[PDB]
Each structure stands twice: as C-alpha cells, then as structure tokens.
Design a binder for this molecule. Sequence first.
Ligand SMILES: [Cl-]
Ligand SMILES: [Cl-]
Ligand SMILES: [Mg+2]
Length: 257
Amino acid sequence: GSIALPAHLRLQPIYWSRDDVAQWLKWAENEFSLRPIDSNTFEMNGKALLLLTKEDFRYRSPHSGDELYELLQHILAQARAAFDLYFVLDKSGSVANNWIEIYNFVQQLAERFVSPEMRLSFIVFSSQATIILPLTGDRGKISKGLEDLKRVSPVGETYIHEGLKLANEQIQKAGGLKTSSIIIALTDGKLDGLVPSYAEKEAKISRSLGASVYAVGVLDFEQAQLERIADSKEQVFPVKGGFQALKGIINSILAQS
Ligand SMILES: [Cl-]
Ligand SMILES: [Cl-]
Ligand SMILES: [Mg+2]
C-alpha cells in the first residue's frame, strides 16, 4: 500500500496548486511507467481535481486516467487517516554534538503531519524518560512542544527502553482501532549493558499494542542494533539521508493506514 509521493507535495491534495497538479502528473508518469501525459491534461488546482469523476479522468487521459484517479484516492485516503506518532528522542551524552540533527528531523516531520486526525507526542530519554509533549493534535501545544525540545541539553546514559515505555503507556490509554499508532526512535544506536536486551524486549510490547516502530539513526550508528528495535530493516532510516530518508519514512508511515 506504499505510495512514493514526492516530499514537496503537501499531504492533503485540496491544497495542491495548479503547479502541484502538474508536478504530480510528471511524477506519476515516471513512477508508474505511464504513457506520455500532457502537462496540460488537468489545468486546475487540487480542489478542482477532487471534483472530477473517474470517467472525467478517463476522458482526459484515455491511457492513464483510471489509474490516476485511483492513485488520487489512495493519496487522499492516507491523508485523512488517523495517526498517533510518538517520537522517542535520545538525549544522552552520545548525541551532544547531534541534538541539531535529531531536532530538525522531528520538526521537519511534525510540520508535515498537519491533518486534523494526526496527533503527536514528544518523549525524551537519557538515564530517565520524560514526556515533553503529551499526545495531541493541537498545533498550538505542539509548537510549545517544539520550543521546549530546542532547549534540551543532551546528558546521561542511553536508556532507550525507558523512552519506549512512556510511548507504550500513552498508547495503552488512547490507542484505538483505525488509529495507526507509530513510534519513531531517533537514537545513535550505542547501547551499553542490558539496554540492548530491554530495548528489543520493549519494542515488542509496542508491536504487541498494534504500534509500528521506526528507528532513525544519527551520525554514526549501529545498523544491526536498530534493525532489532524497528519492525523490519525497511523501517530504519539514516538522518543524514537528508530530504531523501525524510521522504522515505513519511511514506512508510502513511502506508501503515
Ligand atoms: Cl484533502
Ligand atoms: Cl551514553
Ligand atoms: Mg548513546
């Protein structure tokens, strides 16, 4: 159910400009090996595009119209799905020179998930874990949540199982059917002592609650270590992957609905 939508394109198509519709068309054509689509085939914005019928799509693109209609529908269906995103953020001394890297990632990601049925929660952890921002879809509270993350000063050990625990406890209380709970751990992978075991054990609880566990490594990280925390190796993304990993995880999350 994956749609490799370009990063630029807003999550919701009703905000697409006339130029976004052209760019969607150019992308769809290379992504899906479609026959040449005239860039003048849909001369309208997203609002207008949502009013065309499938048969209109066929009139306008006899070769690819039905496919483009369904492609839109999937895009729209994932843009309206419910998501609980829980960011588990490493604040240990291992990442002191990389707090920049973690924060700008969390912010880029939060500024994309803006639909009314998307809530976010910010959790930090070092030796202990703390909830900076309780799960909420309130943009105003989320902004203060971001402003608090900027002042985080990284210190301590890497007790990542404490961080996942605070995600779990929130999911227990408001996790629901048709509410894809997602966990995004931004860490460096340097786990000492029993933390690897407790982490792999605690990520299973997340999977036992219906949540999907994504791992995002910062700077130089242990690839194998994260692979054991995330659901699959396909759910591990390097933060240094820039706009390319950032797109990848978005569409991976969106296709969880
Ligand atoms: Cl929309
Ligand atoms: Cl450490
Ligand atoms: Mg560390």
